[PDB]
C-alpha cells in the first residue's frame, strides 16, 4: 500500500503519537492494555474518560490504557522522520497474533509498502531478543 | 445501534460539522461532490489540499468538495442539540443508493437506534418534496 498523506508530520502519521486532546473514533483500531491487545473502539465517555473497546470481550478502559494505531502513512523517501528509527523501543503486534509486545526497531521500511523489521524482547534468548520479525507499519506504536 | 459518545457536542458528533482544521482519515466515509456521492477517503495532500476518494472510480477533490460523515452518535434523550431539527435543510443519502440529495428533516430520531425521517427535494411533486423516507443518522450531513 502506497503512502496516503502528502506534505512536520501530524499526530497519528506513522510514529507521531496522538495528541492529548485526541479521542479515537468508533471502529478505529487501538492497542488496549487489558497485556496490550488489538482492539476496536466502541464508545467514549467524556464523563469518565473511558473507552469501551472490543477485542478483535468488551473492556472499559481509561484513555491512558488505549494507544490509537496510526491513521496515516507518509513516504519514507520524503518523510523519514515519520518512521521509527533503528534501536527505538516500540510496542509491536506479534505476527499472526492479536497481542502487542515491547520490541526494538531493527530496520524501518525504505518504501511505503514495506514492513518494519523488529526484535521482540524475549528473555529466553541469551541477548534478550527474538530473531528479527516483520511487522506492518499500522501495528507499531510508541511504548 | 446505541449511542457511542457520552458527555456541547464535538465536531463530527451527529449534526455538528467538522472543524476547518479537520482532515478525514484514510478509510473514512464521506460525501464527495463529483452530484454528491458516498465515497471513501484514500489519501490527503497538504500540498494541494486535495483528497483522493474512491466511490463506494477514484477522484481527486478539493477539501471544499468533501463532507465527512459523522463519526459519533449521542443519545437524543440527553443531547438533542446534536441532532438535526425538523425543517432543517440537509444532504441525505437517498435510500438504497450511493447518492446524496437535498432534503428537509421531517423527524429526528427519538432513540439512538432510530433513523431520521426526511423529505427529499423533488420538483416532480406539487409541493416540491418526496413523501417521507427514512435515512440512517450516519448518512445525514449539513448542506
Swiss-Prot record, chains A, B:
Explain what the record says happens when changing residue 101 to A. Abolishes H3K4me3 binding
Ordered alphabetically, the record's keywords are: Acetylation, Chromatin regulator, Coiled coil, Nucleus, Transcription, Transcription regulation
What is its subcellular localisation? Nucleus
Q: According to the UniProt record, where is the region Histone H3K4me3 binding?
A: 120-122
Q: Please give one Gene Ontology molecular function term for this protein.
A: methylated histone binding
Keyword check for Ion transport, yes or no.
no
Residue span, SGF29 C-terminal domain: 20-143
Q: Where is this site: Histone H3K4me3 binding?
A: 94, 101
One GO cellular component assignment for this chain's record is:
SAGA complex
Q: What residue spans carry the region label Histone H3K4me3 N-terminus binding?
A: 55-56, 96-99
Effect noted on mutating residue 98 to A: Almost abolished H3K4me3 binding
Q: Name one GO biological process term.
A: positive regulation of DNA-templated transcription
Q: Tell me, how does this one assemble? A: Interacts with dimethylated and trimethylated 'Lys-4' of histone H3 (H3K4me2 and H3K4me3), with a preference for the trimethylated form (H3K4me3). Component of some SAGA-type complexes. Component of the ADA2A-containing complex (ATAC), composed of KAT14, KAT2A, TADA2L, TADA3L, ZZ3, MBIP, WDR5, YEATS2, CCDC101 and DR1. Interacts with (methylated) CGAS. Interacts with TADA3L, GCN5L2, SUPT3H and MYC.
In the record's own words, the domains note is:
The SGF29 C-terminal (also named tudor-like) domain mediates binding to methylated 'Lys-4' of histone H3 (H3K4me), with a preference for trimethylated form (H3K4me3).
What is the recorded function of this protein according to its Swiss-Prot or TrEMBL entry? Chromatin reader component of some histone acetyltransferase (HAT) SAGA-type complexes like the TFTC-HAT, ATAC or STAGA complexes. SGF29 specifically recognizes and binds methylated 'Lys-4' of histone H3 (H3K4me), with a preference for trimethylated form (H3K4me3). In the SAGA-type complexes, SGF29 is required to recruit complexes to H3K4me. Involved in the response to endoplasmic reticulum (ER) stress by recruiting the SAGA complex to H3K4me, thereby promoting histone H3 acetylation and cell survival.
Family named by the database record = Belongs to the SGF29 family.
Q: What is this protein called?
A: SAGA-associated factor 29
Q: From which source organism is this entry?
A: Homo sapiens (Human)
The top of its lineage is: Eukaryota, Metazoa, Chordata, Craniata, Vertebrata
Of the intact sequence, the residues represented are 140 to 287 of 293
Amino acid at each position: 500500500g502506497r503512502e496516503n498523506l502528502y506534505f512536520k508530520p501530524p499526530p497519528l502519521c506513522g510514529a507521531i503519537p496522538a495528541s492529548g486532546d485526541y479521542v479515537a473514533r468508533p471502529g478505529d483500531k487501538v492497542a488496549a492494555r487489558v497485556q496490550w491487545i488489538l482492539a476496536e473502539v466502541v464508545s467514549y465517555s467524556h464523563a469518565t474518560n473511558k473507552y469501551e473497546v472490543d477485542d478483535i470481550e468488551r473492556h472499559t478502559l481509561s484513555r491512558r490504557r488505549v494507544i490509537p494505531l496510526p491513521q496515516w502513512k507518509a513516504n519514507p523517501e520524503t518523510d523519514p522522520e515519520a518512521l521509527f528509527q533503528k534501536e527505538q523501543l516500540v510496542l509491536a503486534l506479534y505476527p499472526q497474533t492479536t497481542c502487542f509486545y515491547r520490541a526494538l526497531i531493527h530496520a524501518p521500511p525504505q518504501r511505503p509498502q514495506d514492513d518494519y523489521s523488529v526484535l521482540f524482547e524475549d528473555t529466553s534468548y541469551a541477548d534478550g531478543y527474538s530473531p528479527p520479525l516483520n511487522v506492518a507499519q499500522r501495528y507499531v506504536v510508541a511504548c
